[PDB]
């Protein structure tokens, strides 16, 4: 499948090779939950782990399913 990544200058999406089928989007308020806040991360994965709200990651089993929450649609 294809997931969104943020491990570069601009955010893009690639096709995970024989290893990952799910995508992930990390979120956690950086010392600015008011202004900056929830830092947004991106990447592909095979499983879907869980953690405390302080550091959570949304995992999906679809394509382009892990985009920025504030990404301008359209």
């Amino acid at each position: 499948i294809v997931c969104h990544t943020t491990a570069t200058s601009p955010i893009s999406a690639v096709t995970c090779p024989p290893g990952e089928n799910l995508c992930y989007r990390k979120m956690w308020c950086d010392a600015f939950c008011s202004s900056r806040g929830k830092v947004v991360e991106l990447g592909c994965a095979a499983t879907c782990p869980s953690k405390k709200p302080y550091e959570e990651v949304t995992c999906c089993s679809t394509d382009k399913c892990n985009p920025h929450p504030k990404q301008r649609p359209g």
Partner: peptide
């Protein structure tokens, strides 16, 4: 680096 929920702009660590 990564991005914050605020905007889609890049953010140095």
């Amino acid at each position: 680096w990564r991005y914050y929920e605020s905007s889609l702009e890049p953010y140095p660590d």
